[PDB]
């Protein structure tokens with residue numbers, strides 16, 4: 041369908057951990073990024089790679105793992121240790137297979153949330169539940185970068201959201217078949233699940249250190265669009281002649297908030313305002329099936345107009361409960377951005393303004 045899993049939602053279920061042996065040289069670099077970046081051997085190892093055909097990656101899961109592998113290597117290659125010594129040309133023997141794979145998966149050739157969070161995890165024990173204690177990431181960048189904590193907590197938020205996402209068909213089927221009680225129950229269930237997702241979001245503090253996120257991890261998630269360090273973009277050697285710009289926005293490419301904006305008829309992509317165009321651009325960095333899901337929801341009849349047309353206080357309160365849970369998520373997200381980016385930075389205003397307008401637009405959708 042739309043590659044939305046009942047249990048893990050937008051996340052990739054049971055991600056592949058190992059590539060075929062043909063790709064051992066890629067996997068070795070990706071698995072040893074902390075040591076290779078620290079010593080300074082990372083870039084030489086990449087420049088020494090043979091060109092490996094992507095022909096031995098034949099299913100979605102091995103393609104997604106290879107994208108995660110190549111994406112981590114690319115971020116490490118471009119940024120190095122993170123102190124201004126950058127590389128402006130990605131060597132052909134990585135760029136060509138990376139771009140070909142990205143074309144097949146319909147994603148930009150840069151590390152994205154769908155790689156480093158949605159595909160970057162495993163269960164320690166397959167017979168135990170999806171808890172931090174029973175999970176790990178597949179790749180990290182530097183020792184002490186809190187990639188395990190940041191990636192896995194984001195993933196646990198996605199998983200919590202899966203419980204609301206799976207109710208969405210019930211919502212549209214109830215509006216269709218005129219089942220008022222069913223719609224009301226479904227909206228309450230969504231609000232309840234979104235409230236639980238907010239509680240899971242609190243775990244960012246349990247597992248992510250602000251200094252480590254801002255000064256280490258954020259470097260490798262950063263991109264080359266409007267970046268003075270790579271003002272023209274990156275040269276994907278042997279694929280495109282001229283450099284191309286792509287955003288590094290892993291920490292804000294989730295489909296979850298936009299999913300419920302569209303569900304609830306909140307028009308965040310409306311107009312030429314900068315917030316709309318930024319949220320529209322983020323979609324290009326989501327998996328195509330998830331972009332298609334978001335567009336399908338926009339094309340369905342409006343949940344908001346349905347609730348507004350019925351003179352039904354119970355329905356309006358269920359709907360408002362959903363909007364308020366989304367407002368609560370975005371408000372806590374603002375707090376997080378303050379603790380993990382702005383405070384460490386000052387020891388910017390466009391970022392917080394963008395986030396506040398998006399929350400404000402959400403808050404304006406309340407009926408009461």
Ligand code: HEM
Pocket residue numbers: 190193194197198244248253288289290291292293294295296297298370373376377380381391395398399
């Ligand atoms: C340490 C934790 C986090 C930090 C520092 C952070 C940072 C940011 C930043 C800087 C942006 C602006 C766009 C960008 O620069 O990429 C953003 C937006 C966004 N973030 Fe995060 N983020 C964090 C955790 C999360 C989590 C766990 C989620 C959801 C699972 C999330 C979902 C979003 C979304 C959906 C947006 C788009 C704006 C919106 O729709 O309200 N973030 N975040």
